[PDB]
Chains A and B, each alone.
With several copies, the nearest count.
Chain A
Amino acid sequence: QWENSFVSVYSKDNPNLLFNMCGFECRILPKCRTSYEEFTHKDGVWNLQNEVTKERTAQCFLRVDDESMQRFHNRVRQILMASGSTTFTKIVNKWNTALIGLMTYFREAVVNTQELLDLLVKCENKIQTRIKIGLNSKMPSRFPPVVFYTPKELGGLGMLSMGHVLIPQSDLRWSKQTDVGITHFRSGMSHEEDQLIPNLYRYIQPWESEFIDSQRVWAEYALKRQEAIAQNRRLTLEDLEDSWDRGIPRINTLFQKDRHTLAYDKGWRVRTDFKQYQVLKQNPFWWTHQRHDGKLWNLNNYRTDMIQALGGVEGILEHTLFKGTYFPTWEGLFWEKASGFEESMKWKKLTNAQRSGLNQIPNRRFTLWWSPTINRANVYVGFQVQLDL
């Protein structure tokens, strides 16, 4: 039936042809038909080089498909609708997996799809409210971004973000005490571009760039392989280190612990695609499998930077309740897993009545660390009541 048998034609009259495989909407363009003039477009533009002449003959404009945008949107709709009683970590963790599923799946395409940028902004904004609303009171004036973005290692929530967020320079102020005196620090007075939260897209590398790297890297590897064969020896990895995380198959997959079994895993790309029926849970990274391709993204630089943005332990300390514990070394503390502390709850065999009643405990602990940030005369504009005794 012709609606869903839709046909597009690229010809002299039309701007471009087009197809739509997997979750991507694609457009292939030829210079000879004609075009115009521009420059590097990042995510929007990819360059099709002719294998024979080595000429950049056409451009393919990647874009995220409408149906896949709706799935993302609905996933966010759902996580909320389901989570009446779940703890905040369960919410946030689910959101983190959903986002990297899409963010790690589409990667480049996202930047050329304004609709996603709007959608992403709206959905983060929706997400913040659920946690805010889970908190006592129905009104929060500010809630500075530090509390959400700070990594869970420093007692934050570890939220990834693409939305433009203002870290007000009023909230960077930090004070420390030494037996000499009490010193203050504010970088607020330095007037330059203001400080903003780290973006996943910037960390991520455009598809065009990665395709080029894979052609280069794997060709180099092949030549090295030939030499190793001729020289009767095995590659020592140091020969490859220079390209370690580079390639679309991710050359470091060559050194996975289970290769001898994965060698037989054929048809996995359908199966992962086809997995969805077998499992009620639906996953955001349907296109890839880490083992099949290896890791396709690096978590640490972003986390470290968030820490750099956080200002480190000292920055974390002002927001945190850590100095209150009079623990000598920040590094020494290993924090305590809710599940680990929870231990018995996994197997306590009691009337759910004790489910959310104990799951709030991790949330209760979180409040203590950030209470001064959470509670202040300035912050929340609330009636101030002295506690009983």
Chain B
Amino acid sequence: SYMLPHLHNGWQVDQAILSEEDRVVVIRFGHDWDPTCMKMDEVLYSIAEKVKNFAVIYLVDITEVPDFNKMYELYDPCTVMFFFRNKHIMIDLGTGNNNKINWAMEDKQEMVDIIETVYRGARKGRGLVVSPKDYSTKY
């Protein structure tokens, strides 16, 4: 967890989305105490190095910055939200909400595919992508 940095103001969130031109900006929105927001914080931290060349990761806490709760509508322990060139990206995991991510993904590998898929599709301006594995059943 101490690998991955944290964002302590909503102004750290916004500049961080802007200044990274060439890579995804992946953010976990959720709060330290949570059962499920700790688990994801692991599965990302392990992956963050492998992917440094196309994706950048950060951590944010709903309690630290609540400014973003209404606009993106944040419910539940945590939401993974992908950004490329200020454009909110979007993917269908078969789960019935195409915005963000909720459920906890299981393998390191299946997580890297999703990041890679989003980036590759995203690079072409495509706003939707399809997660190869569709965990509607899972979540």
Contacts and interface: CB of A to CB of B under 8 A. Distances in A.
A and B touch in the complex (CB under 8 A): yes
Interface of A: 84-85, 133, 138, 351-353, 356-357
B136 A357 contact: no
B113 interface: yes
Contact of B132 (A85, A133, A138): A85
B137 A133 contact: yes
Interface in B119-139: 132-133, 136-137
Interface in B55-69: none
Nearest to A84: B133
B137 A353 contact: no
Interface in B19-66: none
B68 to A, nearest CB: 32
A138 B136 contact: yes
A139 to B, nearest CB: 12
Nearest to B110: A84
Contacts of A133: 137
Interface of B: 113, 116-117, 132-133, 136-137
B136 A353 contact: no
A353 B133 contact: no
Contacts of A84: 133
Q: What 9 pairs between A and B have smallest CB-CB spacing?
A: A356-B132, A353-B116, A353-B113, A84-B133, A138-B136, A85-B133, A357-B132, A85-B132, A133-B137
B116 to A, nearest CB: 6
Contact of B117 (A85, A138, A353): A353
Contacts, number: 13
B7 to A, nearest CB: 30
Interface of A is mostly: helix
B23 to A, nearest CB: 18
Given A138-B136, A352-B113, A353-B113, 5 more contacts: A85-B132, A85-B133, A353-B116, A356-B132, A357-B132
B97 to A, nearest CB: 15
Contacts of A356: 132
Contacts of A138: 136-137
Nearest to A351: B116
B115 to A, nearest CB: 11
13 contacts: A84-B133, A85-B132, A85-B133, A133-B137, A138-B136, A138-B137, A351-B116, A352-B113, A353-B113, A353-B116, A353-B117, A356-B132, A357-B132
Nearest to A355: B132
Nearest to B116: A353
B10 to A, nearest CB: 35
A131 to B, nearest CB: 14
Contacts of B116: 351, 353
Contacts of A351: 116
B98 to A, nearest CB: 15
Contacts of A85: 132-133
Nearest to A133: B137
Most buried by B among A85, A138, A353: A353
Contacts of B132: 85, 356-357
Contacts of A357: 132
Contacts of B117: 353
A140 to B, nearest CB: 15
Contacts of B113: 352-353
Contacts of B137: 133, 138
Contacts of B133: 84-85
Contacts of A353: 113, 116-117
Nearest to B109: A352
Nearest to A134: B134
Contacts of B136: 138
Nearest to A357: B132
B71 to A, nearest CB: 31
Nearest to B136: A138
Most buried by A among B116, B132, B133: B132
Contacts of A352: 113
Nearest to A138: B136
B1 to A, nearest CB: 29
A87 to B, nearest CB: 13
